[PDB]
């Protein structure tokens, strides 16, 4: 019936004075736009069909054409920012928000989806969706005693669209919109479906990606323990956003970092720092670096959980970017730690993998490492054991690499190197 029409036939049907002919043509458009290989989005836009679809969204008397037009417009809005803009410019936003009230759940769902694509374009369309009043009717759809009574596809779409209203920066979402949405995110974060949980963690990870005030809004809602629990999930689509959220939170104040520690996050990091997915290992090492930048009692909890040998491990062998995060974790540790903690770090074997990384072609990591070596030499000075440390660096081949760096290109490198040789290797 409606399989593989031409754009010309769709146009002729939508321009007929016959609601049923329009409905068949609109469904044909939906099927064209639903095919996976090169949907003719631009031809549909050039044919002037968007204003027609938008008007069909408002035909309460004909719910099937509401659905078909909602689906067609959803897939146009899923394209480039220029294609999403065409949908917005046709007035789709208020029309989709009206459809959130629809008594047909498959139509309400499609309006949820479309608004997610529009909001997902970026900050401007996200805030415009919010200004048109989308948040109240979206949250109303979740005002049930038990989320389990909703179809899980429906619930996944809602969670995903909410996550897009939490997404993006410059600017971040309006504070009052974030406060409005957070209680529902907290509830969704306790729902058993893996996809809902993942999308909820993504939303939280967006909201914690910013200044300390934004982090605080989230931490104050009490979700850190649930995030730590989700950090231990077996589904990697859950672990990835949960870990990103935890990592964002520990970029905050030392008190916010402490709530991640108190919730038990450090117990999960033996697995995360050896995780076979390179992105998880990198994000976990980054997170560790922002914990070793904290107080001495927080460094001490990293020590107590046995995580220093795991940092030595990733420094010794991992993807290069992970190793660079490990280098940072060590430079922060040595910068803020006590003498005892630095002594312990050396006893765990940090020196050799640290030197081995001076061979790398990345001048920033060379700076980070040289800074770490100075910090350790300073702790040795305080113990009068500068010489044991010089001997240890020399035996593993580190001296060779440091003089090689006397004649390095970057100026910060060669001045830090010379200083080290002048002072400790005379």
């Amino acid at each position: 019936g409606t399989v593989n029409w031409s754009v010309e036939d769709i146009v002729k049907g939508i321009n007929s004075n016959n609601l049923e002919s329009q409905l068949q043509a609109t469904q044909a458009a939906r099927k064209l736009l639903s095919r996976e290989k090169q949907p003719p989005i631009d031809n549909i836009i050039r044919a002037g069909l968007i204003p027609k679809f938008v008007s069909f969204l408002g035909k309460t008397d004909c719910s099937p054409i509401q659905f078909e037009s909602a689906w067609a417009l959803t897939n146009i809005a899923s394209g480039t920012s220029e294609q999403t803009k065409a949908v917005v410019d046709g007035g789709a936003i208020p029309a989709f928000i009206s459809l959130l009230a629809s008594p047909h759940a498959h139509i309400s769902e499609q309006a949820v989806w479309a608004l997610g694509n529009i909001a997902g374009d970026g900050s401007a369309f996200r805030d415009l969706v919010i200004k048109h009043g989308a948040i109240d009717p979206l949250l109303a759809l979740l005002a049930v005693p038990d989320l389990s009574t909703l179809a899980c596809g429906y619930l996944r779409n809602l969670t995903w669209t909410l996550s897009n209203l939490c997404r993006n920066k410059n600017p971040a979402p309006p504070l009052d919109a974030v406060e409005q949405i957070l209680p529902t995110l907290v509830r969704l974060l306790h729902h058993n479906d893996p996809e809902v949980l993942a999308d909820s963690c993504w939303a939280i990870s967006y909201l914690t990606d910013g200044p300390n005030e934004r982090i605080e809004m989230v931490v104050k809602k009490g979700v850190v323990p649930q995030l730590v629990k989700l950090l231990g999930a077996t589904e990697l689509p859950i672990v990835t956003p949960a870990l990103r959220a935890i990592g964002n939170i520990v970029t905050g104040t030392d008190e916010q970092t402490q709530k991640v520690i108190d919730a038990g996050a450090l117990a999960v990091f033996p697995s995360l720092l050896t995780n076979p997915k390179t992105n998880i290992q990198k994000e976990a090492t980054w997170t560790m670096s922002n914990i070793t930048a904290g107080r001495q009692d927080q460094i001490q909890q990293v020590v107590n959980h046995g995580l220093v040998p795991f940092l030595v491990g990733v420094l010794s062998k991992a993807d290069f970017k992970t190793q660079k995060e490990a280098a940072w974790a060590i430079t922060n540790y040595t910068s803020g730690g006590t003498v005892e903690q630095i002594v312990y770090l050396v006893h765990c074997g940090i020196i050799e993998p640290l030197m081995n990384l001076l061979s790398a072609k990345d001048t920033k990591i060379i700076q980070v490492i040289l800074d770490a070596i100075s910090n350790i030499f300073q702790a040795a000075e305080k113990l009068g054991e500068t010489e044991k440390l010089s001997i240890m660096i020399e035996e593993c081949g580190g001296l060779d690499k440091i003089e090689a760096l006397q004649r390095h290109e970057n100026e910060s490198v060669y001045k830090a190197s010379l200083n080290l040789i002048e002072k400790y290797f005379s």
Binding site: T84, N164, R167
Partner: peptide, 10 residues
């Protein structure tokens, strides 16, 4: 869904 910012309905 997950971290996709846009997605069509196939």
């Amino acid at each position: 869904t997950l971290g996709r910012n846009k997605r069509p309905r196939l």
